[PDB]
mmCIF file of C-alpha atoms in Angstrom:
data_model
loop_
_atom_site.group_PDB
_atom_site.id
_atom_site.type_symbol
_atom_site.label_atom_id
_atom_site.label_comp_id
_atom_site.label_asym_id
_atom_site.label_seq_id
_atom_site.Cartn_x
_atom_site.Cartn_y
_atom_site.Cartn_z
ATOM 1 C CA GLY A 1 103.441 118.247 90.073
ATOM 2 C CA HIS A 2 99.858 116.371 89.686
ATOM 3 C CA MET A 3 97.789 119.911 88.783
ATOM 4 C CA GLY A 4 98.515 123.140 87.392
ATOM 5 C CA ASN A 5 98.124 126.488 88.495
ATOM 6 C CA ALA A 6 94.558 126.466 87.795
ATOM 7 C CA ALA A 7 93.821 122.880 88.583
ATOM 8 C CA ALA A 8 95.283 124.026 92.240
ATOM 9 C CA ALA A 9 94.139 126.870 92.747
ATOM 10 C CA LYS A 10 89.896 126.376 91.483
ATOM 11 C CA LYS A 11 90.842 123.423 94.039
ATOM 12 C CA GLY A 12 92.146 125.204 96.893
ATOM 13 C CA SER A 13 89.106 127.660 96.727
ATOM 14 C CA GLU A 14 86.818 125.026 96.495
ATOM 15 C CA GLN A 15 88.180 123.788 99.925
ATOM 16 C CA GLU A 16 87.669 126.804 101.098
ATOM 17 C CA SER A 17 84.547 127.279 100.476
ATOM 18 C CA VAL A 18 84.038 124.038 102.346
ATOM 19 C CA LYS A 19 85.017 125.538 105.652
ATOM 20 C CA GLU A 20 82.631 128.708 105.099
ATOM 21 C CA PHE A 21 80.082 126.350 104.433
ATOM 22 C CA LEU A 22 80.784 124.016 107.577
ATOM 23 C CA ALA A 23 80.994 126.857 109.808
ATOM 24 C CA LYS A 24 77.850 128.643 108.999
ATOM 25 C CA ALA A 25 76.509 125.401 109.222
ATOM 26 C CA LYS A 26 78.095 124.188 112.555
ATOM 27 C CA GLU A 27 76.540 127.447 114.199
ATOM 28 C CA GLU A 28 72.860 126.936 113.276
ATOM 29 C CA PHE A 29 73.268 123.530 114.236
ATOM 30 C CA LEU A 30 74.245 124.342 118.022
ATOM 31 C CA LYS A 31 70.930 126.614 118.137
ATOM 32 C CA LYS A 32 68.610 124.522 117.648
ATOM 33 C CA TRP A 33 71.416 121.442 120.042
ATOM 34 C CA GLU A 34 70.954 124.031 122.454
ATOM 35 C CA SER A 35 67.442 124.834 122.035
ATOM 36 C CA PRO A 36 65.810 121.469 120.606
ATOM 37 C CA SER A 37 62.016 121.598 119.755
ATOM 38 C CA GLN A 38 58.885 119.705 121.488
ATOM 39 C CA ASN A 39 55.328 118.831 120.662
ATOM 40 C CA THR A 40 54.922 120.193 117.312
ATOM 41 C CA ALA A 41 52.192 117.828 116.248
ATOM 42 C CA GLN A 42 50.049 115.465 117.672
ATOM 43 C CA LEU A 43 48.444 111.614 117.659
ATOM 44 C CA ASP A 44 45.142 112.195 116.023
ATOM 45 C CA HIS A 45 46.387 114.763 113.617
ATOM 46 C CA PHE A 46 47.612 111.104 111.360
ATOM 47 C CA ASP A 47 45.734 108.110 110.016
ATOM 48 C CA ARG A 48 48.149 104.936 110.759
ATOM 49 C CA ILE A 49 48.093 103.521 107.372
ATOM 50 C CA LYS A 50 50.517 100.105 107.497
ATOM 51 C CA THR A 51 52.423 99.110 110.545
ATOM 52 C CA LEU A 52 56.083 98.751 108.679
ATOM 53 C CA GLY A 53 58.073 97.429 111.264
ATOM 54 C CA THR A 54 58.397 96.007 115.213
ATOM 55 C CA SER A 55 61.089 96.063 120.543
ATOM 56 C CA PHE A 56 61.164 99.284 122.098
ATOM 57 C CA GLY A 57 58.261 100.120 119.382
ATOM 58 C CA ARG A 58 56.536 99.998 116.220
ATOM 59 C CA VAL A 59 56.861 102.231 112.606
ATOM 60 C CA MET A 60 54.251 103.480 111.095
ATOM 61 C CA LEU A 61 53.392 104.303 107.725
ATOM 62 C CA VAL A 62 51.042 107.214 108.445
ATOM 63 C CA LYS A 63 48.737 109.836 106.509
ATOM 64 C CA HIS A 64 48.857 113.639 107.720
ATOM 65 C CA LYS A 65 45.265 113.979 107.991
ATOM 66 C CA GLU A 66 45.128 117.843 107.729
ATOM 67 C CA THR A 67 48.782 118.011 104.776
ATOM 68 C CA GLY A 68 47.746 114.969 103.311
ATOM 69 C CA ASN A 69 51.297 114.139 103.337
ATOM 70 C CA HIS A 70 52.866 110.309 104.267
ATOM 71 C CA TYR A 71 55.133 110.344 106.853
ATOM 72 C CA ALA A 72 57.145 107.322 109.108
ATOM 73 C CA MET A 73 56.154 107.553 112.369
ATOM 74 C CA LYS A 74 58.217 105.714 114.873
ATOM 75 C CA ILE A 75 56.437 105.080 118.057
ATOM 76 C CA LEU A 76 58.284 104.258 121.127
ATOM 77 C CA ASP A 77 56.519 102.434 124.007
ATOM 78 C CA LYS A 78 58.103 104.570 126.705
ATOM 79 C CA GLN A 79 57.954 102.255 129.492
ATOM 80 C CA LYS A 80 60.326 99.807 126.983
ATOM 81 C CA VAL A 81 62.089 102.192 126.341
ATOM 82 C CA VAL A 82 62.886 102.376 130.129
ATOM 83 C CA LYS A 83 62.811 98.866 130.718
ATOM 84 C CA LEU A 84 65.456 97.943 127.789
ATOM 85 C CA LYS A 85 67.903 100.253 129.062
ATOM 86 C CA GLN A 86 67.240 102.921 126.001
ATOM 87 C CA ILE A 87 66.294 106.948 127.951
ATOM 88 C CA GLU A 88 69.620 107.961 126.495
ATOM 89 C CA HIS A 89 70.218 106.695 122.923
ATOM 90 C CA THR A 90 66.626 107.670 122.062
ATOM 91 C CA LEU A 91 66.579 111.352 123.565
ATOM 92 C CA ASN A 92 70.228 111.548 122.410
ATOM 93 C CA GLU A 93 68.883 110.900 118.647
ATOM 94 C CA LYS A 94 65.972 112.569 118.844
ATOM 95 C CA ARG A 95 67.758 115.796 119.564
ATOM 96 C CA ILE A 96 70.626 115.209 117.035
ATOM 97 C CA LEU A 97 67.361 114.702 114.644
ATOM 98 C CA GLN A 98 66.345 117.657 114.998
ATOM 99 C CA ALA A 99 69.253 119.199 115.355
ATOM 100 C CA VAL A 100 70.955 118.444 111.727
ATOM 101 C CA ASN A 101 70.535 119.874 108.581
ATOM 102 C CA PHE A 102 71.623 118.293 105.121
ATOM 103 C CA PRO A 103 70.541 116.590 102.016
ATOM 104 C CA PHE A 104 70.758 112.663 102.635
ATOM 105 C CA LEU A 105 69.825 113.080 106.125
ATOM 106 C CA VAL A 106 65.896 111.692 106.591
ATOM 107 C CA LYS A 107 64.877 114.653 108.463
ATOM 108 C CA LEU A 108 62.338 114.791 111.256
ATOM 109 C CA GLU A 109 58.820 116.241 110.417
ATOM 110 C CA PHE A 110 56.955 116.132 114.293
ATOM 111 C CA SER A 111 58.030 114.846 117.417
ATOM 112 C CA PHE A 112 55.648 114.816 120.494
ATOM 113 C CA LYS A 113 54.611 112.508 123.915
ATOM 114 C CA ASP A 114 50.895 111.076 125.290
ATOM 115 C CA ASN A 115 50.900 109.889 128.555
ATOM 116 C CA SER A 116 52.114 105.952 126.872
ATOM 117 C CA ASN A 117 54.420 106.257 124.048
ATOM 118 C CA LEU A 118 56.662 108.692 122.462
ATOM 119 C CA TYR A 119 56.231 109.562 118.216
ATOM 120 C CA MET A 120 59.470 110.851 115.663
ATOM 121 C CA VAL A 121 57.608 111.862 113.001
ATOM 122 C CA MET A 122 60.039 111.051 109.712
ATOM 123 C CA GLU A 123 59.939 111.601 106.166
ATOM 124 C CA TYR A 124 58.448 108.615 104.224
ATOM 125 C CA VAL A 125 61.599 107.005 101.577
ATOM 126 C CA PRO A 126 59.021 104.381 99.766
ATOM 127 C CA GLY A 127 62.170 102.995 97.991
ATOM 128 C CA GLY A 128 63.263 101.462 101.008
ATOM 129 C CA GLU A 129 66.460 100.612 101.738
ATOM 130 C CA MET A 130 69.453 99.739 100.040
ATOM 131 C CA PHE A 131 69.928 96.696 101.331
ATOM 132 C CA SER A 132 67.419 94.771 99.682
ATOM 133 C CA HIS A 133 68.250 96.984 95.516
ATOM 134 C CA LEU A 134 71.928 96.001 96.834
ATOM 135 C CA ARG A 135 71.143 91.921 97.470
ATOM 136 C CA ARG A 136 68.592 91.995 94.232
ATOM 137 C CA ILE A 137 70.578 93.280 91.801
ATOM 138 C CA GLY A 138 73.827 91.289 93.630
ATOM 139 C CA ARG A 139 76.652 94.680 93.216
ATOM 140 C CA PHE A 140 76.647 97.727 92.315
ATOM 141 C CA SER A 141 79.131 98.853 89.297
ATOM 142 C CA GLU A 142 82.198 100.829 90.304
ATOM 143 C CA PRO A 143 79.886 104.609 88.529
ATOM 144 C CA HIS A 144 76.734 103.532 90.802
ATOM 145 C CA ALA A 145 78.546 102.549 94.413
ATOM 146 C CA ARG A 146 80.638 106.222 93.682
ATOM 147 C CA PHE A 147 77.754 108.298 93.266
ATOM 148 C CA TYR A 148 76.345 106.856 96.911
ATOM 149 C CA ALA A 149 79.730 106.767 98.764
ATOM 150 C CA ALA A 150 80.606 110.754 97.341
ATOM 151 C CA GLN A 151 76.922 111.624 99.209
ATOM 152 C CA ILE A 152 78.178 109.384 102.031
ATOM 153 C CA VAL A 153 81.632 111.146 101.976
ATOM 154 C CA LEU A 154 79.504 114.920 102.208
ATOM 155 C CA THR A 155 77.367 113.359 105.240
ATOM 156 C CA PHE A 156 80.412 112.715 106.922
ATOM 157 C CA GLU A 157 82.292 115.358 106.558
ATOM 158 C CA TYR A 158 78.952 117.005 107.655
ATOM 159 C CA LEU A 159 78.725 115.751 110.491
ATOM 160 C CA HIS A 160 82.510 115.176 112.003
ATOM 161 C CA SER A 161 82.395 119.088 111.078
ATOM 162 C CA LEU A 162 79.447 119.053 114.405
ATOM 163 C CA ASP A 163 81.888 116.138 116.376
ATOM 164 C CA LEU A 164 79.276 113.749 115.335
ATOM 165 C CA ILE A 165 80.792 110.615 115.237
ATOM 166 C CA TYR A 166 77.985 108.554 112.926
ATOM 167 C CA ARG A 167 79.222 104.379 113.716
ATOM 168 C CA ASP A 168 76.639 102.704 112.826
ATOM 169 C CA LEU A 169 76.782 102.288 108.389
ATOM 170 C CA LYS A 170 75.803 99.991 106.284
ATOM 171 C CA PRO A 171 72.963 99.251 103.766
ATOM 172 C CA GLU A 172 70.219 98.297 105.931
ATOM 173 C CA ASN A 173 70.469 102.135 106.854
ATOM 174 C CA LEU A 174 70.955 103.779 103.701
ATOM 175 C CA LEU A 175 67.232 104.936 102.013
ATOM 176 C CA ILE A 176 67.035 106.027 98.332
ATOM 177 C CA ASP A 177 64.881 108.526 97.578
ATOM 178 C CA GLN A 178 62.420 109.086 94.861
ATOM 179 C CA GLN A 179 65.201 110.702 92.874
ATOM 180 C CA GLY A 180 67.418 107.520 93.127
ATOM 181 C CA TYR A 181 69.888 109.885 96.070
ATOM 182 C CA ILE A 182 70.953 108.862 99.840
ATOM 183 C CA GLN A 183 68.722 109.411 103.206
ATOM 184 C CA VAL A 184 70.798 107.717 106.369
ATOM 185 C CA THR A 185 68.604 106.901 108.599
ATOM 186 C CA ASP A 186 68.986 106.012 112.548
ATOM 187 C CA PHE A 187 71.235 107.922 114.609
ATOM 188 C CA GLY A 188 70.471 105.465 117.724
ATOM 189 C CA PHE A 189 74.155 105.208 117.980
ATOM 190 C CA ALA A 190 75.493 108.597 116.990
ATOM 191 C CA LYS A 191 77.193 110.666 119.096
ATOM 192 C CA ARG A 192 78.569 114.442 120.154
ATOM 193 C CA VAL A 193 82.348 113.273 121.432
ATOM 194 C CA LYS A 194 85.051 115.039 120.664
ATOM 195 C CA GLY A 195 87.709 113.123 121.921
ATOM 196 C CA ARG A 196 87.428 109.487 121.824
ATOM 197 C CA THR A 197 85.064 107.212 123.220
ATOM 198 C CA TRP A 198 84.785 103.770 123.908
ATOM 199 C CA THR A 199 81.108 102.172 123.670
ATOM 200 C CA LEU A 200 81.111 98.565 121.778
ATOM 201 C CA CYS A 201 78.549 99.386 119.562
ATOM 202 C CA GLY A 202 77.995 99.093 115.536
ATOM 203 C CA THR A 203 77.471 96.062 113.237
ATOM 204 C CA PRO A 204 79.936 93.108 112.985
ATOM 205 C CA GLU A 205 81.090 93.231 109.742
ATOM 206 C CA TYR A 206 81.079 97.495 110.048
ATOM 207 C CA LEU A 207 83.148 97.504 112.966
ATOM 208 C CA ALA A 208 86.392 99.011 113.013
ATOM 209 C CA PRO A 209 89.178 96.909 114.247
ATOM 210 C CA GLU A 210 90.580 99.698 116.912
ATOM 211 C CA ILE A 211 86.159 99.170 118.134
ATOM 212 C CA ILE A 212 87.167 94.826 118.476
ATOM 213 C CA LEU A 213 90.180 96.231 120.889
ATOM 214 C CA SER A 214 88.815 98.047 122.578
ATOM 215 C CA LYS A 215 90.687 100.722 122.308
ATOM 216 C CA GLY A 216 89.311 104.130 122.599
ATOM 217 C CA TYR A 217 88.107 105.271 119.365
ATOM 218 C CA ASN A 218 87.144 108.926 116.893
ATOM 219 C CA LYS A 219 85.402 109.497 113.734
ATOM 220 C CA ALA A 220 87.833 107.688 111.802
ATOM 221 C CA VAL A 221 85.710 104.417 112.839
ATOM 222 C CA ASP A 222 82.745 106.028 110.096
ATOM 223 C CA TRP A 223 85.626 106.606 107.415
ATOM 224 C CA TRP A 224 86.285 102.437 107.640
ATOM 225 C CA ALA A 225 82.743 101.790 107.548
ATOM 226 C CA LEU A 226 83.224 103.821 104.662
ATOM 227 C CA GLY A 227 85.508 101.674 103.425
ATOM 228 C CA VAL A 228 83.558 98.112 103.540
ATOM 229 C CA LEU A 229 79.774 100.172 102.411
ATOM 230 C CA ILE A 230 82.033 100.789 99.128
ATOM 231 C CA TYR A 231 83.720 97.436 99.051
ATOM 232 C CA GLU A 232 80.327 95.741 99.624
ATOM 233 C CA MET A 233 78.334 98.129 97.110
ATOM 234 C CA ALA A 234 80.925 97.386 94.238
ATOM 235 C CA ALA A 235 81.531 93.086 95.200
ATOM 236 C CA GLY A 236 78.122 92.506 96.860
ATOM 237 C CA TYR A 237 79.459 91.166 99.986
ATOM 238 C CA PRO A 238 80.899 92.907 102.124
ATOM 239 C CA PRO A 239 84.999 92.312 102.950
ATOM 240 C CA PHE A 240 85.343 90.978 106.289
ATOM 241 C CA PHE A 241 82.762 88.105 106.368
ATOM 242 C CA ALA A 242 82.293 84.701 108.485
ATOM 243 C CA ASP A 243 80.026 82.368 110.266
ATOM 244 C CA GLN A 244 79.813 84.042 113.500
ATOM 245 C CA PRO A 245 80.911 87.526 114.779
ATOM 246 C CA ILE A 246 84.130 86.433 115.984
ATOM 247 C CA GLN A 247 85.940 85.021 113.223
ATOM 248 C CA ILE A 248 84.535 88.285 111.756
ATOM 249 C CA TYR A 249 86.707 90.017 113.735
ATOM 250 C CA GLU A 250 89.416 87.868 113.067
ATOM 251 C CA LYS A 251 89.831 88.814 110.026
ATOM 252 C CA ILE A 252 89.151 92.647 110.728
ATOM 253 C CA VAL A 253 92.303 93.505 112.847
ATOM 254 C CA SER A 254 94.385 91.455 110.456
ATOM 255 C CA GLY A 255 95.453 93.920 108.519
ATOM 256 C CA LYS A 256 94.346 92.012 104.979
ATOM 257 C CA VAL A 257 91.571 92.081 102.380
ATOM 258 C CA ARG A 258 91.233 90.424 99.251
ATOM 259 C CA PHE A 259 89.019 92.274 95.850
ATOM 260 C CA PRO A 260 87.328 90.369 93.164
ATOM 261 C CA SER A 261 89.301 90.899 90.238
ATOM 262 C CA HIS A 262 87.005 92.905 88.333
ATOM 263 C CA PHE A 263 87.430 95.625 91.390
ATOM 264 C CA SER A 264 89.581 98.468 89.733
ATOM 265 C CA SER A 265 93.346 99.279 91.295
ATOM 266 C CA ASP A 266 91.886 102.854 91.794
ATOM 267 C CA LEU A 267 88.980 101.379 93.400
ATOM 268 C CA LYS A 268 91.619 98.888 95.197
ATOM 269 C CA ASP A 269 93.776 101.844 96.003
ATOM 270 C CA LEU A 270 91.327 104.157 97.766
ATOM 271 C CA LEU A 271 89.868 100.867 99.925
ATOM 272 C CA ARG A 272 93.366 99.886 101.026
ATOM 273 C CA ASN A 273 93.735 103.923 102.445
ATOM 274 C CA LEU A 274 89.705 103.294 104.413
ATOM 275 C CA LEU A 275 90.716 99.695 105.251
ATOM 276 C CA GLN A 276 93.504 100.754 106.601
ATOM 277 C CA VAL A 277 94.258 98.699 110.373
ATOM 278 C CA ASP A 278 96.849 101.698 111.319
ATOM 279 C CA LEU A 279 95.228 104.955 111.715
ATOM 280 C CA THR A 280 98.015 107.160 111.502
ATOM 281 C CA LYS A 281 97.263 105.884 107.774
ATOM 282 C CA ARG A 282 94.009 105.700 107.269
ATOM 283 C CA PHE A 283 93.117 108.215 104.957
ATOM 284 C CA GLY A 284 89.752 110.850 106.633
ATOM 285 C CA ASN A 285 92.176 110.628 109.622
ATOM 286 C CA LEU A 286 95.582 112.604 108.636
ATOM 287 C CA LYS A 287 96.336 116.068 108.105
ATOM 288 C CA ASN A 288 94.085 116.561 104.758
ATOM 289 C CA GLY A 289 91.111 115.052 106.939
ATOM 290 C CA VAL A 290 88.734 114.276 103.956
ATOM 291 C CA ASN A 291 90.909 116.114 101.289
ATOM 292 C CA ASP A 292 92.373 112.699 100.902
ATOM 293 C CA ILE A 293 89.163 111.159 100.194
ATOM 294 C CA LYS A 294 87.607 113.678 98.058
ATOM 295 C CA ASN A 295 90.653 113.994 95.816
ATOM 296 C CA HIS A 296 91.529 110.556 95.646
ATOM 297 C CA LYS A 297 91.586 108.863 91.830
ATOM 298 C CA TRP A 298 88.300 107.177 92.218
ATOM 299 C CA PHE A 299 86.580 109.970 92.567
ATOM 300 C CA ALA A 300 88.221 112.542 89.974
ATOM 301 C CA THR A 301 84.741 112.307 88.030
ATOM 302 C CA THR A 302 83.068 112.770 91.059
ATOM 303 C CA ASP A 303 81.728 116.391 91.084
ATOM 304 C CA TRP A 304 80.753 117.027 94.372
ATOM 305 C CA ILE A 305 78.748 120.175 94.250
ATOM 306 C CA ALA A 306 76.950 118.630 91.972
ATOM 307 C CA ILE A 307 75.971 116.131 93.768
ATOM 308 C CA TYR A 308 74.740 118.219 96.712
ATOM 309 C CA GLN A 309 72.920 120.162 95.002
ATOM 310 C CA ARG A 310 71.056 117.056 93.307
ATOM 311 C CA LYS A 311 71.761 117.768 89.775
ATOM 312 C CA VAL A 312 73.298 114.724 89.129
ATOM 313 C CA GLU A 313 70.997 112.122 87.506
ATOM 314 C CA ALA A 314 71.228 109.248 89.757
ATOM 315 C CA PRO A 315 72.239 105.636 88.119
ATOM 316 C CA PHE A 316 68.798 104.267 89.753
ATOM 317 C CA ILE A 317 65.859 105.553 91.116
ATOM 318 C CA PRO A 318 63.054 102.406 92.315
ATOM 319 C CA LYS A 319 59.929 102.005 90.657
ATOM 320 C CA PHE A 320 57.936 104.514 92.063
ATOM 321 C CA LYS A 321 54.826 103.393 92.481
ATOM 322 C CA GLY A 322 53.383 105.876 98.915
ATOM 323 C CA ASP A 323 52.853 102.362 98.057
ATOM 324 C CA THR A 324 53.941 100.164 100.629
ATOM 325 C CA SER A 325 55.271 97.532 98.369
ATOM 326 C CA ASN A 326 58.848 97.830 99.262
ATOM 327 C CA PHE A 327 58.126 96.348 102.768
ATOM 328 C CA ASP A 328 56.889 93.009 104.556
ATOM 329 C CA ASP A 329 53.629 93.707 106.175
ATOM 330 C CA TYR A 330 53.098 92.811 109.298
ATOM 331 C CA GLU A 331 50.184 92.415 112.038
ATOM 332 C CA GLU A 332 48.928 95.581 112.439
ATOM 333 C CA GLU A 333 48.841 96.059 116.788
ATOM 334 C CA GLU A 334 46.814 98.899 117.787
ATOM 335 C CA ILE A 335 48.476 101.218 119.636
ATOM 336 C CA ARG A 336 46.631 102.202 122.436
ATOM 337 C CA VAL A 337 47.694 105.349 125.155
ATOM 338 C CA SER A 338 47.065 104.876 129.028
ATOM 339 C CA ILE A 339 44.718 107.400 131.582
ATOM 340 C CA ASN A 340 48.328 107.821 133.400
ATOM 341 C CA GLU A 341 51.125 109.521 132.083
ATOM 342 C CA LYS A 342 54.304 106.185 132.116
ATOM 343 C CA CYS A 343 57.875 108.043 132.708
ATOM 344 C CA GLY A 344 57.100 111.490 132.617
ATOM 345 C CA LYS A 345 60.549 112.423 134.098
ATOM 346 C CA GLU A 346 62.507 110.443 132.755
ATOM 347 C CA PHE A 347 61.240 111.633 128.833
ATOM 348 C CA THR A 348 61.066 116.024 130.158
ATOM 349 C CA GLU A 349 63.238 117.016 127.439
ATOM 350 C CA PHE A 350 61.626 114.613 124.153
ATOM 351 C CA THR B 1 83.996 81.363 94.791
ATOM 352 C CA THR B 2 84.182 84.008 98.233
ATOM 353 C CA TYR B 3 80.197 84.490 96.625
ATOM 354 C CA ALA B 4 79.338 81.118 97.326
ATOM 355 C CA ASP B 5 80.832 81.390 101.079
ATOM 356 C CA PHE B 6 79.394 84.708 101.571
ATOM 357 C CA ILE B 7 76.247 82.419 101.152
ATOM 358 C CA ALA B 8 77.402 79.998 103.265
ATOM 359 C CA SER B 9 78.483 82.228 105.818
ATOM 360 C CA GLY B 10 74.246 83.091 106.609
ATOM 361 C CA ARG B 11 74.972 86.441 107.224
ATOM 362 C CA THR B 12 73.120 87.248 104.022
ATOM 363 C CA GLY B 13 69.706 89.241 105.278
ATOM 364 C CA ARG B 14 69.504 92.805 107.101
ATOM 365 C CA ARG B 15 72.438 93.084 109.971
ATOM 366 C CA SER B 16 71.663 93.502 113.510
ATOM 367 C CA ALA B 17 74.066 95.693 115.372
ATOM 368 C CA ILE B 18 75.495 95.284 118.789
#
């Protein structure tokens, strides 16, 4: 066999230990999920520093007057939310964020509402998105890409144990904190589902073929997306791209991918097993589950526990200015709370 | 090159969902 008794027993015990962590993690999640927290701050607790983004609402850098600590506050206009048919998405996203707990998931620190708006007060990550670092550097070396990939593998293993499908993996949704580690943001398309689901959602370059083909699909779409992400991090561009989304979908369902000549054989083997159209052969979807991914040769040097514990030295630390340096400043359009409670019943649960 | 093709795609910027 590939490993003798010492290696095989240590691996077995580590895998059993993961099961024990997940079982406890699921119990903590379900309590918060069945009994969500509400109204844990108010607007006048914060000073609006800078509008960091602007459809359904804006995201503003704010400063807690009491704490002094900075936060990223998502302001959602309740009427705009209702008019654009986003009630369930917004409720679900906040309910997931308040219930999950994992070191690579951006944290909801406060939530509340007033007559006009819904507010989600998140951890502020001044390093910004992986997207811009990746486009700036060009591509990440395989060890650098692997350090990020390991965190996503663990995060998906966590999320899938809770029957959550993430469905919007991409560098735009991965923030880099001040220790160089990944924070996943934007659970707007995440769904708690045990079996199949059918919604056409995601980003074109990251869509699994079974989504494109109008099939019912499951959590295996996140493992396909992991493959696109690893490819893009190590190549500098995604495996499937074209002028128009339709031509991207053609390449995705074709079952063909080409790799740069600088990809190691270990990497190409992993990516062929993730970017696998056949669901009965896609890593993450087989009898051994996530272990086929964790035990793959490309991850041989990965110390999964040390990554989870954040003991591994990051390959890259964004310039520690919090400064809005890594964000394109917008017109600070003020926030006004109507004298009348708008859309009370629709957002009772928020 | 593939890289040039990526540039030619017009999809080098931040990509929206849906």
